[PDB]
């Protein structure tokens, strides 16, 4: 009782940090894989998706 | 008759109407701009003239 909202997330227990994935934001986010060239710092972040 | 140009003839005239600014033209408000670089160097359109 009182559960405000119930989502269907990717399983962090399965897609562990050992996978390099970071699910806390609600999307997978693997750093330093498909990083773009020739852009300002912080512009890499969308490619983490 | 209309007045003869001073430069037309060989006389020396030691009084003349000199145009001049009322004050210094270097106010000190030099122009300054905001250059803002391309976001991605790869994305620039070199093409088309």
Swiss-Prot record, chain A:
Belongs to the turreted BTV-fold inner capsid family. Homodecamer; each decamer is made up of two conformers of VP2, called VP2A and VP2B. 12 homodecamers assemble to form an icosahedral capsid. It comes from the Viruses. It comes from Bombyx mori cytoplasmic polyhedrosis virus. The chain holds residues 199 to 247 of 1333 of the full protein. Inner capsid protein that self-assembles to form an icosahedral capsid with a T=2 symmetry, which consists of 120 copies of VP2, with channels at each of its five-fold vertices. This capsid constitutes the innermost concentric layer of the viral mature particle. It is found in: Virion. This is Inner capsid protein VP1.
């Amino acid at each position: 009782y009182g559960a405000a909202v119930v989502n269907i997330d990717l399983n962090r227990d399965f897609f562990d940090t050992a996978t390099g994935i970071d699910l806390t934001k609600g999307i997978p986010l693997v750093q330093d894989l498909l990083v773009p060239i020739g852009v300002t710092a912080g512009a890499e972040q969308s490619a983490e998706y | 008759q209309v007045g003869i140009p001073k430069l037309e003839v060989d006389h020396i005239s030691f009084s003349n109407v000199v145009s001049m600014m009322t004050a210094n033209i270097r106010t000190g408000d030099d122009m300054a701009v905001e250059r803002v670089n391309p976001d991605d160097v790869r994305a620039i359109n070199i093409r088309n003239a």
